[PDB]
Design a binder for this molecule. Structure first.
Ligand SMILES: O=C(CNS(=O)(=O)C1CCCCC1)N[C@H](CCNc1cc[nH+]cc1)C(=O)N1CCCCC1
Lengths: 27, 241
């Protein structure tokens, strides 16, 4: 049931370059 | 994708590309929602005015691809068992432009992973200003080697309606920067079916909020891209799964 959790990123406690933008938009 | 950028390896594990058997050609994009189900845009399979009517035996999918270069020991091919277009697909404003293609189950990997479907997330993440991510190997301009990604803010209902002459239904939503927003960006031809995702700051998961459906031109000032409002059609998806 681990949907959305990207192995190369979330699973490895890593984040992609443009990821922060989205989160900042959430405020 | 216009004004997009190169996707990193494994940035979108749910990214799937739809191909036609013969002539072997890339038709649309799609998302892996589970090990046996793929979500895409209805017009990718059915669109009567263009004598477009494809079935499970005229197509095939390819998952885990970064470049359009045989990603050896990474990418996976698959045939479709059945296809499902929404019964009320208005192909005559593309209302309810959504479809489900059933695959044998694909083996998950660091490059192949399913995206989450929105839950009552929808109410929180669907707000004008909030950005989402679009991905696709579609046209770079109106008139790529690797996957393209572009973050775009969702636009409010009234702005969406005023920017077009097509009857906008509640089963969709527009996104993109305004003519005086500064940045540019938009999906384009070939990007049809591509996913529109958002990262939930509550459970750290990616949810596919929409599907690339239509848009007047590509990255035109005053125009915004319209995506299928996935959550609203979740009931259908749930019923057929
Ligand atoms: O959507 C169009 C054109 N729009 S349209 O002619 O005004 C028309 C399309 C049918 C529904 C009502 C609007 N063409 C697309 C191109 C790819 N989609 C885009 C997504 C975001 N940004 C720009 C374009 C297309 O090829 N289609 C042809 C089949 C029907 C709709 C999709």
């Amino acid at each position: 049931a681990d949907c959305g959790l990207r192995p190369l990123f979330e699973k490895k406690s890593l984040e992609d370059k443009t990821e922060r933008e989205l989160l900042e938009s959430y405020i | 994708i216009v004004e997009g950028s190169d996707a990193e390896i494994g940035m979108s594990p749910w990214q799937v590309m739809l191909f036609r058997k013969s002539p072997q050609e890339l038709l649309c994009g799609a998302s892996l929602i589970s090990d046996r189900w793929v979500l895409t845009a209805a017009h990718c399979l059915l669109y009567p005015p263009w004598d477009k009517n494809f079935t499970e035996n005229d197509l095939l999918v390819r998952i885990g691809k970064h470049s359009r270069r045989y990603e050896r020991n990474i990418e996976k091919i698959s045939m479709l068992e059945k296809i499902y277009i929404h019964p009320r697909y208005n192909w005559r404003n593309l209302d309810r432009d959504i479809a489900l293609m059933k695959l044998k189950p694909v083996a998950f990997s660091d490059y192949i992973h399913p995206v989450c479907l929105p839950d009552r997330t929808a109410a929180s993440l669907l707000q004008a200003g909030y950005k989402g991510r679009v991905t696709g190997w579609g046209n770079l301009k109106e008139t790529p080697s690797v996957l393209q990604v572009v973050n775009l803010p969702i636009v409010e209902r009234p702005v969406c309606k005023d920017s077009t002459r097509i009857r906008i239904t509640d089963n969709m939503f527009c996104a993109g920067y305004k003519p005086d927003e500064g940045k540019r960006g938009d999906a384009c031809e070939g990007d049809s079916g591509g996913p529109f995702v958002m990262k939930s700051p509550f459970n750290n998961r990616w949810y596919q909020m929409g599907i690339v459906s239509w848009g007047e031109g590509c990255d035109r000032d005053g125009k915004y891209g319209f995506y299928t409002h996935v959550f609203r059609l979740k009931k259908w998806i749930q019923k057929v799964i």
